[PDB]
């Protein structure tokens, strides 16, 4: 009896300068996934001419996908976020200007929150499939610091 | 100074020396560090020498016209230093 199930799950994205104090996100679209990421590759491996190995560390990023219902309230703040541009609003060394961080939440309890980083891609209008319906938007963000929260 | 003696799998070379090193820093590797180093031979003839065991048993090196340089201090005195003992 383990329970693996979705249902449930709420995201807060506070942001630097855009939305300072942060936006919720609690509707999911139903034909993609609402939310996935790629694979971690933080290792790597070169082989010597004894016939050894050897292991040392390299850099990797983080990358997640999230897909809404088009015409919600959270798609409209998504693509405020996409809108803004890096080269706007104030300066300060080393920030990664407005850096979105992503606090998400488990059905079962579990928290991870993620941080050191920006938004990436997106769509810009609506699209119609052949059957009438509009598809649903997704997004893709990228983050530096994983921090390991996983707690109950 | 010296010289190095560099064995592969199964060869073995003899009178190298270090000529370049090329150490690297890149986001593929950051807890080691990707090195390319360079050896030249020294190149000398008669590569086998011929060597006596008898310091007294050996051929005569040739030290040609150098200066008595001088700077002394005197005569009677270093030498009733060398024979009085002091």
Do not use: H, W
Not at chain 1, 13 to 37: H, N
Not at chain 1, 93 to 101: A, E, K, L, N
Not at chain 2, 31 to 57: C, E, H, W, Y
Request: hydrophobic letters at 40%; proline letters at 5%; glycine letters at 10%.
């Amino acid at each position: 009896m383990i329970n693996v199930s979705g249902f449930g799950t709420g995201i807060v994205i506070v942001s630097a300068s855009s939305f300072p104090m942060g936006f919720s996100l609690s509707k999911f679209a139903d034909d993609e996934s609402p939310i996935s990421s790629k694979e971690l590759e933080p290792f790597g491996y070169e082989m010597l001419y004894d016939g050894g190995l050897f292991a040392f560390d390299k850099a990797a990023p983080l990358e997640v996908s999230v897909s809404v219902i088009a015409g919600s309230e959270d798609d409209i703040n998504l693509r405020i976020l996409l809108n803004s541009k890096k080269g706007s609003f104030r300066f300060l060394p080393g920030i990664i200007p407005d850096m979105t961080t992503l606090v998400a939440t488990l059905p079962d309890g579990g928290r991870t929150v993620l941080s050191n980083g920006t938004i990436l891609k997106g769509p810009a209008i609506d699209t119609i499939q052949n059957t009438g319906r509009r598809k649903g938007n997704t997004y893709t963000f990228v983050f530096g610091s994983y921090l390991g929260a996983q707690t109950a | 100074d010296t010289l190095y003696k560099v064995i592969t799998r199964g060869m073995v070379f003899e009178r190298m020396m270090c000529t370049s090193e090329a150490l690297n820093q890149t986001p593929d590797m950051i807890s080691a560090t990707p090195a390319r180093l360079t050896f030249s031979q020294v190149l000398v003839q008669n590569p086998k020498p011929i060597m006596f065991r008898n310091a007294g048993d050996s051929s005569m090196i040739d030290r040609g016209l150098a200066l008595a340089e001088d700077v002394v201090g005197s005569a009677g005195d270093l030498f009733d230093y060398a024979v009085n003992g002091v």
